[PDB]
Amino acid sequence: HPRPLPAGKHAHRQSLETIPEVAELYHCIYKLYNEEESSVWFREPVNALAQEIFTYYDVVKSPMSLRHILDNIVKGDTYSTALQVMEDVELIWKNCITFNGANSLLATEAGKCRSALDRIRRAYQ
Amino acid sequence: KHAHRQSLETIPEVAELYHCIYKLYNEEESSVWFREPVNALAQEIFTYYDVVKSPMSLRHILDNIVKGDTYSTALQVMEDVELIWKNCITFNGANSLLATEAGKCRSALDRIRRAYQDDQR
Ligand SMILES: CCOC(=O)Nc1cc(-c2ccc(C)c(NS(C)(=O)=O)c2)nn2c(C)nnc12
Ligand SMILES: CCOC(=O)Nc1cc(-c2ccc(C)c(NS(C)(=O)=O)c2)nn2c(C)nnc12
Ligand SMILES: [Br-]
């Protein structure tokens, strides 16, 4: 018996029998949608984010956030050392690369955060 | 958002680091993506459909071209592509990183379109 079909990416049509100026533009828009890192935000309808949030919990084995680390420090039942804390902070960055890819704007943001923490920690001295 | 504890009675190296992580979480623009758990971000989806009158995506434009019952001209197609950028500014503001990304996309399309036509000639 047939299960309902999952959502996915647009299947590209090598050839189309519409107007040439529209067909050309289609091929161009497909490349943008498929290859350009900056298109990530605009590829799919916004309601497909639910689906992506679901895929995140399938892809990333150990999810992590700054909130989760801060709340765990306060609770006092998780972290005995600063190195333990930093392994979770590194994990945020590793998860981000894992899910978003190294070329993504989010990978760049993760890198900025890493060094912004280094700055703040060194300035705390 | 996490309520900051001015003083904590954990180890000094952990406590110092906590204060540092809080500043990152609270003040650093680049931390926005990593502040809260990913499942908290589903909330924004519903607000988007309240704010943006005519939502639009690249998927919607691509599927509509293929179907052949929407777009008669290239200018029609581009009005929907422009709409994606107008919606982005509307929802995120002009100064946002996402507004910059929308701008990069506009030009990335210009690049690809010109590389398509110059490739032919
Ligand atoms: C200031 C920070 O605000 C935001 O993060 N804003 C926005 C975020 C996203 C968004 C997130 C994640 C993903 C994976 C996608 N891609 S998808 C599944 O829709 O193809 C889109 N779309 N978006 C659109 C449209 N307009 N604004 C936003
Ligand atoms: C409709 C447009 O509104 C939004 O959905 N906006 C936002 C969306 C997301 C978001 C969702 C899903 C995913 C998978 C990701 N990527 S991540 C950070 O997990 O690597 C991001 N973050 N976000 C943050 C921060 N601030 N706003 C938003
Ligand atoms: Br988390």
Ligand SMILES: [Br-]
């Ligand atoms: Br849409």
